[PDB]
């Protein structure tokens, strides 16, 4: 897949010839209740970040791009990616770095009197130019140099960010409604409670912990030895929907206490009807758009392309490791082209560009993975699950009575479950656990039995340094430099590590498919 042919669009055609022969199985293989449970899981796992990022974007951009634009863009891009992409298991959605770039670009446009939405239109115009030239010259062949080192650093860091944000949301809930001796019994509720309320933070913590506990217990019950095997596996596959339903009913039967619920817009309309329409004029909405910003948009477009490229390509690498039993192939050239082109086209309509998010795609792949008698057996590689997820995300506006009764705390527990379960296949997470284990308890794996224990701990500590450096950069105003610092791990692995490690040590520690050299 990563071979450089030398033919124009050669990788794109081979990606088209690799996956599209399997198109018939991509519909038939989804005829199992495990796929339906995965659909229910990924619907919330994609809808809640969409709503949160849409609200944040609307607040930070004066509703030029809000919840409705993000929902519609997510639905349309997910549908078109599932129906056409070479790796349907990816989930296309908005991410944190994209939000940071949106804030930076809105600040820059507010400084220089530029129209934000038109600048985004021109950035999306320059996005399509870059990805086409990249696919033409097979620029997606450089992803063969992202070894398990960078993949696991990126995945572990993103999982830690997800867990940290999940806990910080509960911290914010406890800050909004602190535990007091006395409260005001008549506090305005519209739009949100203007003052602290009793029993709110504690019930939110209870619901979040209960959802996480039920999800983990049902995940254990899946591998357990209780009940008939078919019924047990059916119930275990539906662990997240069962936990969500249980905690939603629990909160529903407590009428008096206020808990924050899911909020969806009234209709499929623009978030600011006085700012923009559905189509944004490239020459300007109110004022004549400057000619120089049409050419000056290339550099922000370059940064956006770098962000989306790194995110989507590393996500494709992670979800398509050979050890996950992916026997249907993944197309690096086709998926990048579809994602960046859809982002550029959606820019023309004032809608966000999206990327293959790591946590959502990993959770989708995990929910579609069948376990043998501890051992990965097969993966439900099909297009129906992502298509139904995107359709439901689009229909979220229509199903407000169902969503209005779902507390955010339940979804916080689901987020924590996703974050802790995304650490399964990471060898960096395994080698971090070996820091707190005596050497006699280490499992029999190639990086243990052919590398000295202190050498392995030094190798893990070097990655921990990289994780700390990346985490500090995230919490700084220069958090858009994360892709370049992440790329800087590749010279570290392929240049500096051979200066202090032997070939057999690096082969055991940094292996393409967990092989003993």
């Amino acid at each position: 897949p990563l071979q450089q042919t030398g033919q124009l669009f050669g990788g794109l055609v081979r990606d088209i010839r690799r996956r599209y022969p399997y198109y018939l199985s991509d519909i038939t293989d989804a005829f199992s209740p495990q796929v339906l449970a995965a659909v229910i899981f990924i619907y919330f796992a994609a809808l809640s970040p969409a709503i949160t990022f849409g609200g944040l974007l609307g607040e930070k951009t004066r509703n030029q791009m809000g919840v409705s634009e993000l929902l519609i863009s997510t639905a349309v891009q997910g549908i078109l990616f599932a129906l056409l992409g070479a790796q349907p298991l990816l989930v296309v959605g908005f991410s944190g770095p994209l939000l940071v770039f949106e804030e930076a670009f809105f600040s820059f446009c507010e400084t220089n009197g530029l129209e934000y939405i038109v600048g985004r239109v021109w950035i999306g115009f320059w996005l399509i130019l870059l990805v086409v030239l990249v696919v033409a010259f097979e620029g997606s062949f450089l992803v063969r140099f992202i070894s398990r080192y960078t993949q696991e650093i990126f995945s572990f860091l993103i999982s830690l960010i997800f867990i940290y944000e999940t806990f910080s949301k509960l911290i914010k809930i406890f800050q909004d409604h602190p535990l007091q001796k006395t409260y005001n019994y008549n506090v305005l509720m519209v739009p949100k409670p203007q003052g602290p309320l009793p029993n709110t933070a504690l019930l939110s913590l209870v619901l979040m912990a209960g959802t996480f506990f039920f999800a983990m217990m049902l995940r254990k019950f899946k591998n357990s030895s209780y009940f008939p095997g078919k019924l047990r596996r059916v119930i275990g596959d539906f662990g997240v929907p069962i936990s969500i339903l249980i905690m939603v009913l629990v909160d529903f039967f407590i009428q008096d206490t206020y808990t924050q619920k899911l909020s969806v817009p009234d209709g499929f309309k623009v978030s600011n009807s006085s700012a923009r329409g559905w189509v944004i004029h490239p020459l300007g909405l109110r004022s004549e758009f400057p000619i120089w910003m049409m050419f000056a948009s290339a550099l922000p477009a370059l940064l956006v392309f770098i962000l989306i490229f790194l995110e989507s390509q590393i996500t494709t690498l992670i979800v398509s490791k050979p050890e996950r039993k992916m026997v249907k192939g993944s197309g690096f050239h086709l998926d990048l082209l579809l994602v960046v082109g859809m982002g550029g086209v959606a820019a023309l309509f004032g809608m966000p560009w999206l990327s293959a998010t790591t946590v959502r795609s990993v959770t989708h792949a995990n929910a579609l993975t069948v376990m043998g008698k501890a051992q990965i057996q097969e993966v439900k590689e099909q297009r129906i699950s992502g298509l139904l997820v995107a359709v439901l995300v689009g229909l979220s506006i229509l199903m407000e009575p169902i969503l209005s009764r779902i507390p955010l705390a339940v979804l916080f527990g689901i987020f924590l479950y996703m974050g802790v379960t995304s650490l399964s296949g990471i060898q960096l997470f395994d080698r971090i656990l070996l820091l707190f284990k005596p050497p006699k308890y280490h499992p029999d794996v190639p990086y243990v039995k052919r590398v000295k224990t202190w050498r392995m701990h030094l190798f893990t500590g070097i990655q921990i340094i990289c994780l700390a450096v990346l985490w500090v950069v995230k919490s700084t105003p220069a958090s858009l430099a994360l892709p370049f610092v992440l790329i800087l791990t590749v010279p570290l692995r392929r240049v500096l590590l051979p200066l202090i490690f032997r070939n057999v040590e690096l082969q055991c520690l940094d292996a393409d498919d967990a092989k003993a050299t």
Partner: protein, 40 residues
């Protein structure tokens, strides 16, 4: 659109068609150059 928009000579489909044509011309020029290189 929404509210009151500044009147332009080119409508939105016309201007986006012109932009796509210029982009296609640039990409075609680059591809023709790349075809020229690595042969002579």
């Amino acid at each position: 659109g929404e509210r009151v928009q500044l009147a332009h000579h080119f409508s939105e489909p016309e201007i986006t068609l012109i932009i796509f044509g210029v982009m296609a011309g640039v990409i075609g020029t680059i591809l023709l150059i790349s075809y020229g290189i690595r042969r002579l």
